[PDB]
Amino acid sequence: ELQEKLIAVNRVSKTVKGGRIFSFTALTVVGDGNGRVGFGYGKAREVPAAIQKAMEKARRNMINVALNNGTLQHPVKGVHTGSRVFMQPASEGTGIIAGGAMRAVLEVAGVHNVLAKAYGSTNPINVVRATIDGLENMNSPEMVAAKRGKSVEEI
């Protein structure tokens, strides 16, 4: 039932006496379709070993986001290295309109209706990093009520 998505595969290279050593990298996300998302990143000489190492990482290192009927609480900004990220809770019917890197994160997360956009570097590893943290710092109508010490209508 966990949902897992392959976001990007890439070839890097290391240089030695004999020449270049080629390897691969894999960036993935797993999610429970109901408010939990992890991302993983693995390296290996062959692609399958890399796509597999990443899922393994993605399964742990997983976090919770305070969803709201399949959509977000409030607009949110996320940032990590080059990537400035922005997300909005859209009305019902829209679905996920977003770049590939973000769509995969939001899909597996369970965010059903959102407007998203990535600014600056669309480098996938940092875009997803920035989205996860955005969702993670995203606070909930109940916690702000708890924080402020009042269960007014706003609860």
Added chain:
RNA sequence: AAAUUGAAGAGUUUGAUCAUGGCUCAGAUUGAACGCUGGCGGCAGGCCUAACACAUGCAAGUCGAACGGUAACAGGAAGAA
């Protein structure tokens, strides 16, 4: 009752990387042209250039119920046949 209730990214500097930064692509749009091709219809559009120059026709007339009027054609008439 309804009536802006909406927003995607990709390639390319490096051995590889992240950042910076330009170039390039996917989209809509057009009073278009050219190349290949071309059956019918409805609705629209059609000198963007030389406010360059223009043969010919046509594009501003109408009223005899303002007026003297008859030259055309149309009848009518004492009177010519």
